Design a protein around this ligand. Structure first.
Ligand code: SF4
Ligand code: SF4
Lengths: 82, 82
């Protein structure tokens, strides 16, 4: 929707395996540590920028100037510190 | 040197912990799998774009339009497939 939203065809997105819907991602296979794969989303990711965008479209450290979907996922998923 | 070279102060670089010289990085601590930390550099990283730039300054999938140093390192280090 937002013109600056990261596309799944964007080369950097493809490299990272980003998907607007975490259900379409290889997260169960990646088996990244921190939380069960099913629980892994941009919403609880360390690199997500909540002070960026509006609504479901917040920002991400790996995609400067662009917006990821809070329900998405990518291979760099890291549980938000706290 | 190249105007498009990724700076260590660049926000995305800081997030990823990128360092022009892999010796200045937290690679021994990160203990990423694939090759001994000492052996980890952009030169043997999966996301490095060799067909981009010239000399020591080649490209990287995580830094679109920018150039990383082949001797560098960042937390996303992944041994080049092959
Ligand atoms: S690093 Fe995190 S916030 Fe960014 S696209 Fe990936 S899963 Fe989402
Ligand atoms: S992902 Fe690889 S090529 Fe890119 S800055 Fe990092 S260590 Fe270097």
């Amino acid at each position: 929707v937002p013109a600056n939203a990261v596309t799944e065809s964007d080369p950097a997105a493809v490299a990272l395996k980003y998907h607007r819907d975490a259900a379409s991602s290889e997260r169960v296979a990646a088996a990244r540590p921190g939380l069960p794969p099913e629980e892994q989303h941009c919403e609880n990711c360390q690199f997500m920028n909540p002070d960026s965008a509006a609504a479901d479209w917040k920002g991400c450290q790996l995609f400067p100037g662009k917006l990821i979907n809070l329900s998405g996922w990518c291979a760099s998923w890291t549980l938000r510190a706290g």
